[PDB]
Amino acid sequence: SLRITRLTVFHLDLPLAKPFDRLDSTYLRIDTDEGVTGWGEGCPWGHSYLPAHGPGLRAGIATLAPHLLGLDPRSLDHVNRVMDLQLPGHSYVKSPIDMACWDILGQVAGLPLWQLLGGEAATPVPINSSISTGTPDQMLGLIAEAAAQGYRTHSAKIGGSDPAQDIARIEAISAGLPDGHRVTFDVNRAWTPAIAVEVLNSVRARDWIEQPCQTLDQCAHVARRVANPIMLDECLHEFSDHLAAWSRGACEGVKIKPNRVGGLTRARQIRDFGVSVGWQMHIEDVGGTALADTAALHLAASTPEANRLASWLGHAHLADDPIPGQGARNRDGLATPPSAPGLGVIPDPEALGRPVASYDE
Template sequence: MKIETITVFQVDLPLEHPYWLSGGRLKFETLDATLVRLETDTGLVGWGEGTPWGHTYVPAHGPGIRAGIETMAPFILGLDPRRVLDVERAMDLALPGHLYAKSPIDMACWDITGQAAGLPIADLMGGGSRTPRPIASSVGAKTVEETRDVMERYRKRGYIAHSVKIGGDVERDIARVRDVESIRQPGEIVLYDVNRGWTRQQALRVMSSCEDLNVMFEQPCETLDDIAAISRLHASPVSVDESLVTLQDAVRIAHDGLAQIFGIKLNRVGGLTKAARMRDIALAHGIDMFVMATGGTVLADTEALHLAATIPDDHCHAVWACQDMITVDVAGGRGPRNVDGHLHLPEAPGLGVHPDEAALGDPVGEYA
């Protein structure tokens, strides 16, 4: 089997509600999605997606994905997509770094491989738990009142997990954390996501003030060095998200005890192949996980669900899915959808969902 054609589509994904990153620092209204179709000489077709959370969140942007695919295409064409490690090495040789540009190709290869084997990707990877995964909301609000309103909107959709964005103002952050804890319902999972929004002293002030609540904070500071510097000075569980990019990052975090939770974003780390290694580092060191698409359609959400299904149930807190936040559906209602705040693993071979090409418009790139 060989990859014969790579076709690239660009789709704008308007958000249902304007979204502010932690502390209201950045506003997002539309995501720039790249969808990729790999066609093989046997007729099997695989799909991948790369949708960064805007272009100001982390070093990733939509045009960069499309430019990266154009650069890598000559090295990928003619390879067997089932040999995902060969494809991974070809991409790394053709374009060092730029992991976010490689993720949709990796995803499409796993889709083809699963179809060829007649198995869902999660089963092919050796996992495949059918326990529905809670979907974590993304509460990008700024005030106590707005936070309550957004959480209640998600609760009405069945959500039991919430990622509450804080950061930027110490007193306001303490007030929001304490207010959310005061209305937290039994069984709810709440992660307070700072998105790198605190300095070291701000992090210590908030986390120390909230130690009695025993809550989880995600990415409290900009870098791993910052997180390391304050790690012995507070008692709050920490999740690392934006600073978890490479396998070397995962090894350092685990070895140095910098975090108790990994937030694995598939597009950021380069796709399933690389993310699976981070999963294994986490499991070997007793580190729990959230698994997330950086953003995007049901395709990206489904990829995250497949990785989450390879993690033992007790070690996977939730998945983050973007489909309830956008107003465009490229798959006509197919694929894993919110059912009482959870996603259920698809039983179809491969990814388990493909887009309607008519919903994607004309290709913006084709390589053969």
């Protein structure tokens, strides 16, 4: 008999700290007849990073609202089935909805998400830096910085059509890393296979390379020809892409991002599959405020230590904060998810602005 009673949609205009200069984030409030309210966030990283954009996100909540009204939000797999029937794909639309129902379930259950996701403890999860693309000594300065801030894993954005510079970047960074630190070379689909093969086979570094090419097939091809661990990310849209990645032997790890795979319920199924096949995983969201970071972090904290790599906190990159003082935050390069029932963050609607849409029955 618990029923979803109202969905309210907020649009947050979030300038980035280091300027696209802004993010378009959607906050979603879900009410129930018994007065338990859940919240979710979907904030695509602009509209060019993934099949996702803020105005489409809000349009998708509109298409789904009338099918979500009156569902029992405690039945998470059922909620997801209904979302899949009513609007295929659009994982970016589905994530904040699924996030908010999880929040409800955790509040009704009296348990934080990390415990519903199976974890023994609110594990402090190591956080990782983003090193933006530049020259060999530039990136190396940005790393010295991040290390001073307490990051011990760093994700260097590299890529291009120019084999020589990526070679230079990789060999400088891989050698001039502080002792005990970890670096991932994030190419974000910017190589063709020819470049990946030339670059990686010219370099002694055997660090992680993340998503070197645009497709799974192109990544698998690179993997058979080079010696580095390959991490997949943006080409994984649904569970079947992960199964294909596994069956092609394409990778040794994946990133799992709720807004890319359709929320916590889908992410958890992927996470369990990754543990079963020995993958190591970065579990984080695509972008947004500490609300999105918190949901991801509950899933990251509940992952076996052998399989869990550092998480990125998207809110580190924002000029503003709509939910100051809430969520997993960086404390000496570690973020601990909250232990209160549900998500553990409650946005104040006054901080958010006036709702851009609202659906009742």
